Each structure stands twice: as C-alpha cells, then as structure tokens.
Design a protein around this ligand. Structure first.
Ligand SMILES: O=C(Cc1ccccc1)Nc1nnc(CCSCCc2nnc(NC(=O)Cc3ccccc3)s2)s1
Ligand SMILES: O=C(Cc1ccccc1)Nc1nnc(CCSCCc2nnc(NC(=O)Cc3ccccc3)s2)s1
Ligand SMILES: O=C(Cc1ccccc1)Nc1nnc(CCSCCc2nnc(NC(=O)Cc3ccccc3)s2)s1
Ligand SMILES: O=C(Cc1ccccc1)Nc1nnc(CCSCCc2nnc(NC(=O)Cc3ccccc3)s2)s1
Ligand SMILES: N[C@@H](CCC(=O)O)C(=O)O
Ligand SMILES: N[C@@H](CCC(=O)O)C(=O)O
Ligand SMILES: N[C@@H](CCC(=O)O)C(=O)O
Ligand SMILES: N[C@@H](CCC(=O)O)C(=O)O
Lengths: 313, 313, 313, 313
C-alpha cells in the first residue's frame, strides 16, 4: 500500500494526464486504414488497483485494438496452460538484440522472446492445439474476459482483414519459422498466422485493459471478481519479459528510467503494471520513432518521478 | 520484512549453501597466476540485512579480488558525485548486445553500459578528475570502506601487476576509446588503465562485500553504521544496470529465473542484492562458460525458488 | 590460343579427370528425393572451346538440373534484354557478405547480387514482364537452346514439384521482397516463385552445358553455330559476378586459387568459364560443406595449376 | 599487345586526363597536417608499359606518400620471401566484409586480408624477422628501388611522426592482434607498428610508382631493367587481392565496372595494373566518401570504357 489515500493519488493522475496532453508530437500509424483513421488527439488513462478501486480520465471508453499489447497476454495464457519449461522449448527469454538486429531467429533457431513478432507467432501456435481456429479464438476471448473482469473485449474485423492482407513481413516470418521447424509437429502455419492476425485485432478500452493489467499486478487474481485467472508462474514470467522486451528498442531506456513492466502497441496503447499496486492502460495514437505512444511514454516517466514507483526506488 | 524470523532464514541459508557445495563443475580462471592459485573448493556465503543482522557460512574470511564486481560500485560513485545526466553523456544504459557482439562501442561511439570493460574504463576516467592516480585510488578506497562499514577492504599488488602486464584486450579498448574521443577532455588514457587495473585488484571477503551489497539494498545507507554513503539516484541506477547487465551473457536467463540485481567477477564472486531486504556475497573460484561462479549461480537460483525473492514474485 | 595442340590438352583433361575421380568425400544433396536419388560416383567433364572443338570424359550424357547454375544464365538474359542500368536498379553487384550474413537484403533493401537466391528471385521478376508464366518459360528455354547450340536442354517436373513444395525459405524470401517493394510494379510474387522453381528445374548434360559456358567464354557468340546470343555487356557483367559470387561462401578461396568465373549448383554441377579459351561443365553429385561439388572443386584447382589458366597467371 | 600504336594511346591518355581534371569534388585527407597541406588541384597520371615505354601528364614529379598503396607491395615481398602457404597462415584471403564490418579479425582470429590495416600490420611482422627495424626498413627500400627500376623512392619523416602520434586506431589493432596471438612467436608489437608507420610514409612520384605497377603487370620483371624482382606466385596473389580488396568498400563496384587490379591510398594515389599491358599511377589528393581519389576513380572508369581493358572484355 504505497497509496495511503486513493483520492489524492487520483488527483495526481489527472495532473500527469493534463501534462502529457500538451505533448503533441508523433505520428499515428498508417500502414493500414483502420489505424490511420484515428485522431491524434485521443488520449485516455485508466487505473485499476489491486484493491479494485478505479479511476479514468480522457478518452477511456473508445475501443482500440490491442495489437502488440496482446503478446504478453497470450504468452501468459500459454505458460498458464503448458508451464514455463514447455513454452520456452519453442521461444527464448533473451531481451537483447544480442547480435540479431532484425533477425527472425537466434543462433539456436528460436525466436528471441515472446515480445517480438516471430516469438508471438510461435506462442500462438502452442495455444489450445488440436482444435479449429474458431475454437482457439473463443478460448482466448473467454480468457481475456476473465482477465478484464468481464469488461469490454471486442473484435475488429476490418483490422483483421487489412492486417492479413498487408502483413507480408509476418508471412515471411511464418515461412522462415516453418523452414527451421519452429512450430510443434503438425502445425498449419498459414492457419496460425490468421489466428495471430485475429489476436492483434481484439479490441479493448482503457478501462477494460487497465483491469487486465491490474490482474497481472495482482498475482494473477482479477481485482474486481477475485477469481484466479493466471498461475503465479505465468504472471511472474510475463512481467519479467515485459520489463525487458515490452517497449521495442526503447526497452532499455524505459527499464532504466521507468523500471516498470509494460507493453506497447502500434494503436498507441501502453499496458503498464505496478506490481502489487495497480494496473494501467494509457492510450494515444501518435507514436514516436520507436513505435511507442508519445503521450504514453511522457506519462510513464512523470508517473515514476512523482510517485516513486520504479522497481528499485 | 519478508523475513519474519532471521534465525530460521539463517538455517535455510546453510541448507542452500550445503546443496550448492555438491556442485563441483566449472574452471578456476587462469589467465593470470594470481587467479589460477585458488582452490576450486573454496566456497562461502555472507548475508547482511537492511537491519544489520549478519550470517556467514563457509570460507567467508578469505580475501579475493573484486575484479568485475567493482564495476557497479565505481559506477555508483561516479553517479553519486556527478549525477545521472553527466555520467551517461559518456556511457550507455543498454543491456542488450543489440547488434554489437563484442564491439567496444555502440553506433553512437559510446560504450554500451557501465557493466562491460569499455564502459568501466570510461567510468573510471570520470571519477575525481584533475588529481593524481594515487589520490584517486585513495578516494575510492575510502568510499568502499564506508560502503563496507569499515570491514575488510584490501589490495592485491600481484594481481594488479599481472592484470596490467597481460591485459592486451583492455589496452586495445583504451586506444579505441581514445580514437573516438570517448574520454573527458585532457584524459591520460594509459594512466586511466592503471587506475582501472588497480580497482579490479581491490580485495574483499564475503563478509565485507556482503555489507557493501547491503548498503545498495538499503537505499544507499550502510546497515551497520547508519551513514548515507550513496545518493538514492546512484543506488537506483546501479541496481537497474546490475539487473540487466551484471551477469555477462547470462544476464537474460538470470533476470528471468532469479530476478535480482547482481554482478559477477572472474575471481568467482557474485555481489547479490535483494532490495530492501539484504545484501549478499557468494564466492567460489570455479567459473562456468559464461564466466559466472558455478556454485554461486546454483545458490542464487535455489535462494529465489525457496524464499520467493524474485522481483516479480 | 593458350592451347597450341587440342589433342594433347585433351590428354591432360583425362588425367585431371582421373585424378579427381579418387576424391570420394562429400554428401549428395538430399533435401528433396529427386536430388537424393543420384549416385555419388557419377562424374563427368565436358569441354567446348571458343573454336567449337569438343571433348568429354565420364558421365557426360546423364541429365541433371542446373539449379543455381541457372542464376548467371538468367541474369545474362535480363541484362541482354534490359541493360545493366535497369537490372541493377533492383539488384546489387556486391560479392561480399559485407555485414549481411544470411540477410535477404542489403541496407538499401536490395538483394546483394544476382548469385544468391533473393537476387535470383528478383532477376526472375524482370524477364519478359507482362506475359503469362508459360510464355516466360518458353522464352528462356529458347534462349538456353541458343546458348547451347541446340544441344540437350530439358525439364524436370518432379524436381519442380518438390522444390516448390519444400521451398519454405524461398517463400520467406519472396514475402520479404514484397514487403520492401523489391519487385517491379504489378508483380505477382507467388507466380514469380513458380517461375523461379521451374528455372532451377531445367535439365542439361555436361555436354550441352559446356557449350553454354563456351558461349560466355566467346563474348556471347555460340561456338558451334556462330550466332550472337548475348550482348557483350551481358557477358562481361555475368562473368564479373560469377568470379566474385558464383561459388557460395567459397568464392573468396576459389577466386584466389583458381581465378576463373564459375557457378556451382546443388545438383553437383560447376559451370566453368576460361575467357577467350573455352567453356566447361564439371558434374559430380557429392557436395562439400560449402555446397560445391567435391570432385569439381578438386578438378578446378588442378586444371589451373597445370595449365596456368588463372586470370592473373 | 592491345596497344598497336603507343603514340595514339598516349594521345587518348591525355584526353582522359583532361576529362578527369574537370572533376573537382572530394576532400583532401586532413587527419594529419602532412596530408592536409596538399593542394586539391594536384593531378597526375604516369604510364609504364610491359615494354618499358613511358608517358606522363600533369603533376607526375611531385612526391607523395604511398600510404595504403604500400600494402600490396609489402604483401608481395612477404610471399616472395616466405611463400603463399606460410603468409596465409597469419592472414586471410577473403575480400568480403563477410559479416565482419569493422572488425579487426575474422572468426578464425585472423585479419580478413592483406589489404586492410590489421592485415597489413600482420604482414609487416612477417618480413625479415630477427633483424632490427632499421635493417628491415632498408631491406624493403631496396626492394622498392628494384620494383621502380631505381626511380624516385623517398621517405617522409614528418608523416611518419604524425602517423604514429595520432594512430590510436592502429595501436588498438596492434594490442588486439597481440591478445589473439596473431603475430609470429617473439614479435615486438610496438616495434612492428613503427615499421608499419614508416612503410606508409615512403614517398614516390607518379612516374616511379607507375614503374612499380608495371613490374606487377609484367609477371614480376621490372620493365626498365629486365630484372626479376618478385616471384610469379607473389605477383599472382597480389593481383588477385588487389582486384577484390584494393579499393576499400568500393572494391565491389570497382571490380564490376573497371575490372582491374588496383590499390588506393589516403594521399590520393591509385596504383593501377593492366596485366601484361602496363602499370599506372594516378594521383589527386581529393578523396571521396570511400577514401578513393575522385579524379582517379573517374579516370579509371573512363580508361576501361574507352580502351576495353576490363578483365572480362
Ligand atoms: S533475416 C533473415 C532470415 C534469418 N536469417 N537468419 C536468421 N537468424 C540467424 O541466422 C541466426 C544466427 C545469428 C548470428 C550467427 C549465426 C546464426 S533469421
Ligand atoms: S571490434 C572492433 C573495434 C570496434 N569497431 N567498431 C565498433 N563499434 C561500432 O562500429 C559501431 C557500429 C555498429 C553497427 C553498425 C555501425 C556502427 S567497436
Ligand atoms: S533475416 C531477416 C529478414 C531481413 N531482415 N533484415 C534484412 N536486411 C537488412 O536488415 C539490412 C540492414 C543490415 C545492417 C544494418 C541495417 C540494415 S533481411
Ligand atoms: S571490434 C572489436 C574487436 C574485435 N572483436 N571481435 C573481433 N572479431 C571477431 O569477434 C570474430 C567473430 C565474428 C562473428 C561471430 C563470432 C566471432 S575484432
Ligand atoms: N499487427 C502488427 C502489430 C505491430 C505492433 O503492435 O507493434 C504486426 O504484427 O506487426
Ligand atoms: N580484470 C579482468 C576482469 C574480468 C571479469 O571480472 O569479468 C578484465 O578487465 O577483463
Ligand atoms: N533450388 C535450390 C537451389 C540451391 C543451389 O543450387 O544452391 C534453392 O532455390 O535454394
Ligand atoms: N596511415 C593510414 C593510411 C590510410 C589509407 O591509406 O587508407 C592508416 O594506417 O590508416
């Protein structure tokens, strides 16, 4: 309980929100129309404590796609159902670019970590094996519903259709992983890519996503339902990798100055977790060179400076 | 206070110690005679809580050189005296090998981080500039005395002499850094290398070093004297980088499975920090492929599994 | 005329052939059944001078697929029809792995050179644009007939079918090239890959292929028909790149010790050219670590030592 | 004899010279004062056929330092005296940057080739081992006198002094090579660097250097004295490597468009060899991004287009 008075803290959240609001730099992702449509002025921040206490400011009810923010979530599901040992038989745990800038695989022919595309694609192939794609999708949707305590969790068909149609790089990754036998025996690679595109197209709001983050911050228990959603093992692994691989090539500077587990997405979202304290979702479409939401990054740095939430504070 | 009963915990430390004792693999460093002399069976573990409570098992009073274990300590001193902004004007904060396996510098012509040789050499050039080497050395020795609450802090002249005489790679690094103007204006590169070799040759015991670690775990206050030795800023930065760059190329697997800030050295030492709980020093000469003490690594994994000290537990 | 007496030279060719015959190391390619079927003892060498004089020894009438040996040939066709400037607008001319080990593209997002798969795939997309694949294939077949002075030029449907079905890496390359807009406007990437697989599946004999090589050695004029098949520009460019990029990662050692333009293939063939003297085709299924025919490599080194054919002799 | 009439050819050389004279781009090297002093308008071209016929235009009698142009010459001396096998026991033959951009050594801990600094430094350590530096220097000076048929061969003490004083990168290379045991047993690395700096400081004129090149073009026999200076083996190896590694990172484009063995230097010189025809030395201080003389590069491209001297023409 580093927050003696929730109300006062709420008052500081609004100030930080207001401050980040002035930051207008960045560029809204436009590789597909569904992302290009978004207004650069959309900006929201939702908070959900381990207590179940809530607070939102800004555009917190406008749905947007998780995109890469879904990576830690599906990695968590895989570990929850299969265990650490099995999952990392197919994907690495290294946060570095070691000496593999852009390579789809490391020297052991394994994706570097679950937080980059090649790794997410492999993780996607491990979940609920043996059933059709429709059944796999429903399975993950239910899982996300629990993580979000039944709050907003939708799907963007337009994003899915455009993502699949212009995802040449992801298809290149898929064929290379097939080349190196990176998938479990009997995997339909193309079918796995569709499932991958679908997962990136799942929609949330800052409010529902903040609850998902709060669940990770609460050892795997949903703060607003009390249900155990993920195993302690799944949560710990997910946080470790979000800490070191969740903010693209900015992970290093982020880990040093912010020191919190987080995961960004091209839609402008930033899933932030403050272990044993709260979960958060910051969202603002304009992205910086690294691909991280400009307002989100600013807010995160300010939040840690003010409240001393850094893991090593 | 994750340790309700110190005595019971002490009892578990002995069991873990005993367990790691069976691990006999590894190779004692032998690039110089001063390291080759050490018996592979030397094994000690000292603990010093934020309280000031102590406990040792094994060879905890046999002096050994800090070697790379001194890197976070001198980085801490630099930040303490110069501030974060200035220090990182000369050295990076990236834990990755990004795409620089073995390179002495990153694309910006800066050492990757304070935890690799090139970075340590640059950091060494920033401390107490303007005075002779003898004065710089005395300054750091006093600083280490405070960190250790006046316990054992010596110096190995034989190691220093051999380190300097066979350190061709460090001299190559020194001339390259000079090439790229990596040092502050007016630096005597060769003189900086001597100071660097001297720092690596400083001796400690598991007992004194554990107190140094406890000081880092206690926000910069020495647990057995109550004195403020390092600024909060220095401690936080040091821990962040020990977490991501302190265990050579094993940092990734270490961060994932152990989740604690640590720094190893070729003498077989492992400076371990459990934020707000305790500081530790594990020592055993036999090193694994990565250059980390075999017994130390084993002990660290066991300690986290048993006591749930992982940052994200 | 470095060959005063053709008959005596013919006698030396048989000795070299006999010598290489003792070299039995290597492994027959087996990624597909059509290559795995081949006997490791098949060994033939055909020679065709700029004069039109012929000579064969060994298994010179057993058809085998050109595979990568077709790369310089189709590159020659492209330049012949489009000119140097246009072709290299899509592919590089660098023989080095510069700092791109295995990368499909260089820093300018262009395949390194026409002699590696990504480059061959792009070159394939430039030939006879606007017509259907069947028409493109017939066009190249006619071109090869001329180069071979109407001698054996067939097609292996089984190889084509297997190559396409197991070519995951080539499909990964195709999608990446599409990602980076490497193909001319309006290219059907998948359709280009089929054409690429078909070209690799074209069959020849040592005898017909030697004539193709002789055509390159004769400034673009077929030695046995007198017809101008390729422009002087096409021949010069092709030879330059065969010299520096035609023997996989062995190109460097090959260029130094043999000094002749050549191109190997996984079927065990080695298209060798001795400028203004003769063309040759060596064939033996067993390949070395680099992917080059063991007997072929041995024969090439011996040929240069004995007859002093090295470009700088 | 691709030059039926020397006089007419001489007339074309003047036209090409005049044409390149208009090219004024580039920057005179200025890392040391001795290079910075040179006027950007100095431009000369000397030719010396295998016959012994001469021709000069422009500033052909102004002395300038060989710098890197000396690399192939000292490599030739080493092979001449020690043989191919021994020399390449210490240095590679690969022209590529393979996957070693800037690295001082390849995966086998050997310099990539004799044409880059690390390789030149190692080659320098193999010549006339066992005698003092003064004796080694005199030995090479005599060798160069023979190669130049006793024409201008001097020494720049000022360049030597400045080269050694600011050569931090070369000293870094020297200590790294020592680290990896790259030198023959008992080598005084620092003493080798001085010898290396001295060799780079040897002076020539376009006229004397053209004779050195003519000697390489004439199988190792000096065109104006008839004496055998280098073994056939030494000449062939030197030309092979000049062809693939003599023009810095431009070697690839140079090999493709010019197709001649050449070696550039930071003083603006370009040692050009036309096998069995002539030797040439082009000189003009202004260098391009790659470090090659702008006028020299232009002249070389024009020379090949006009006279069809390309190895594969
Ligand atoms: S990009 C292109 C497709 C890929 N090609 N290679 C890849 N990963 C490695 O090749 C591993 C490696 C990294 C460094 C050294 C050896 C092997 S991914
Ligand atoms: S090892 C040898 C001495 C070094 N050479 N280059 C180094 N660092 C970079 O060269 C930075 C770079 C990394 C990747 C791309 C460009 C520049 S260190
Ligand atoms: S493997 C994988 C698919 C590829 N990814 N990157 C590739 N080529 C470059 O990324 C160019 C580059 C080389 C070196 C530095 C920058 C850019 S190919
Ligand atoms: S720059 C710096 C000093 C050097 N460090 N490493 C170098 N060469 C390799 O390290 C060989 C290597 C290249 C690629 C993979 C393994 C080993 S040179
Ligand atoms: N759908 C995008 C997401 C990118 C991102 O969120 O960073 C991809 O697969 O690359
Ligand atoms: N003196 C050694 C220390 C190595 C280590 O502790 O890892 C060096 O400078 O490389
Ligand atoms: N069809 C093979 C040919 C390989 C070779 O000839 O080297 C490929 O496309 O990789
Ligand atoms: N003395 C310079 C010569 C550079 C050059 O000629 O390219 C060096 O050793 O780097």
């Amino acid at each position: 309980s580093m927050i003696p008075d929730f109300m006062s803290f709420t008052s500081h959240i609004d100030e930080l929100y207001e401050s980040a609001k002035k930051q207008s730099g960045g560029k809204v992702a436009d590789y597909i129309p569904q992302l290009a449509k978004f207004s650069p002025d959309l900006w929201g921040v939702s908070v959900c404590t381990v207590d179940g206490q809530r607070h939102s400011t800004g555009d917190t009810k406008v749905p947007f796609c998780l995109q890469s923010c879904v990576k830690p979530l599906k990695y968590a599901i895989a570990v929850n159902d299969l265990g650490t040992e099995y999952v990392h038989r197919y994907v690495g745990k290294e946060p570095s670019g070691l000496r593999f800038n852009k390579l789809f695989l490391n020297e052991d022919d394994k994706p570097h970590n679950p937080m980059v595309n090649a790794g997410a694609i492999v993780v996607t192939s491990l979940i609920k094996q043996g059933v059709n794609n429709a059944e796999k999708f429903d399975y993950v949707m239910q899982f996300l519903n629990k993580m979000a305590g039944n709050e907003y969790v939708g799907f963007s068909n337009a994003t899915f259709q455009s993502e699949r149609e212009s995802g040449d790089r992801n298809f290149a990754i898929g064929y290379y992983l097939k080349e190196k036998k990176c998938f479990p025996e009997g995997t339909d690679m193309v079918g796995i890519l569709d499932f991958y595109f679908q997962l990136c197209s799942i929609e949330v709001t800052c409010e529902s996503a903040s609850v998902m983050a709060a669940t990770l911050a609460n050892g795997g228990f949903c703060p607003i339902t009390g249900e155990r959603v993920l195993s302690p093992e799944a949560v710990r692994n997910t946080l470790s990798l979000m800490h070191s691989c969740g903010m693209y090539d900015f992970s290093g500077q982020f880990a040093f100055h912010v020191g919190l587990p987080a995961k960004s997405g091209v839609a402008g979202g930033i899933l932030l977790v403050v272990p044993n304290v709260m979960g958060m979702m910051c969202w603002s479409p304009p992205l910086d060179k690294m691909g991280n939401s400009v307002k989100g990054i600013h807010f995160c740095h300010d939040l840690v400076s003010l409240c001393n939430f850094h893991n090593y504070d």
